[PDB]
């Protein structure tokens, strides 16, 4: 419905790095290489950071081919093409399987994970309008997916917050955000 089905912001620890990437096509790859003018690849290897430390420098060498994000049939999937694992925190996915909303799920190389389903969010949007304003307001976090390369964060890892991982991205799902907006304005 909007021009870009998602927007991605890349971070290094607690600092944002580079411009915002807007996905023009249904499929997308976030790699650590250096192509600056491909609408299908979000290349992180070209982005500079004058406060970058060594651990981030080492982590960026292992991003490799990175993660593939594609949006088909009202569903978006994340497939780990890197030789290192990626770690996804998707509240819509955790909702579907009944996990804690903050659950981080590791995707090993060659694996694939359904990180978001439109109909499930649309159903939760309809269930939450009945619950009041705050219930619909808190749904903004459902439109956001955060994933990190190589290193994960949570109660199992030494890094406790996503701001402690050396390389991570944040996805905004513009489709759901627009539907959430149209409900919020009329309430």
């Amino acid at each position: 419905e909007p021009a870009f089905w998602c927007s991605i912001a890349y971070y290094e620890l607690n600092q944002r790095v580079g411009e915002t990437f807007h996905a023009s096509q249904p499929s997308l790859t976030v790699d650590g290489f250096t192509d600056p003018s491909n609408s299908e690849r979000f290349c992180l290897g070209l982005l500079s950071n004058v406060n970058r430390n060594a651990t981030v420098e080492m982590t960026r060498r292992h991003i490799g081919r990175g993660v593939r994000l594609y949006y088909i049939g009202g569903e978006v999937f994340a497939e780990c093409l890197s030789d290192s694992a990626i770690f996804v925190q998707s509240p819509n996915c955790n909702q579907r399987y009944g996990w804690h909303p903050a659950t981080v799920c590791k995707i090993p190389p060659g694996c694939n994970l359904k990180i978001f389903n439109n109909q499930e969010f649309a159903a939760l949007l309809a269930q939450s309008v009945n619950q009041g304003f705050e219930a619909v307001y808190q749904l903004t976090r459902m439109c956001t997916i955060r994933m990190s390369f190589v290193k994960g964060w949570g109660a199992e890892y030494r890094r406790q917050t996503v701001t402690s991982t050396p390389c991570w991205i944040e996805l905004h799902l513009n489709g759901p955000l627009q539907w959430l907006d149209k409900v919020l304005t009329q309430m």
């Binding site: 694992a85 090993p108 994970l113």
Partner: protein, 127 residues
């Protein structure tokens, strides 16, 4: 292609029931029946379950639902404790590039859906 590729997380409060309720397990996303040919393929999935649970001595029957559009495999153990130890090795694990999740299933429903499990009390092991 059909190989185990680690866990998605460490199993605990945030993703698993507190303790095993039933000696039967429902395991989904182990295969995709639309892309399977013939009647022999189910053995490879059965062996894959037994290799991942090689330490467990309680599994006495495993059946795969060939019509299951979600790729569901059902496992019967001797005791709920043995089904609990099969849970920690299967839930949240990656197999064939897909994420495997496990739910506990009542014994009557297992016997209602797979009456062959009635005369299975001998532990199974991988070849």
């Amino acid at each position: 292609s059909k190989v185990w590729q680690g866990q998605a997380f460490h199993l605990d409060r945030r993703n698993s029931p507190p303790n095993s309720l039933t000696p039967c397990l429902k395991i989904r996303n182990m295969f995709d029946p639309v892309m399977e040919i013939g009647d022999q393929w189910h053995l490879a999935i059965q062996e894959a379950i037994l290799e991942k649970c090689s330490d467990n001595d309680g599994i006495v029957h495993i059946a795969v639902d060939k019509n299951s559009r979600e790729g569901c495999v059902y496992v019967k153990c001797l005791s709920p404790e043995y089904a609990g130890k099969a849970f920690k090795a299967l839930h949240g694990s990656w197999f064939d590039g897909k994420l495997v999740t496990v739910k506990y299933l009542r014994l009557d429903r297992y016997h209602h859906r797979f009456p062959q499990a009635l005369t299975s009390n001998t532990p199974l092991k991988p070849s």
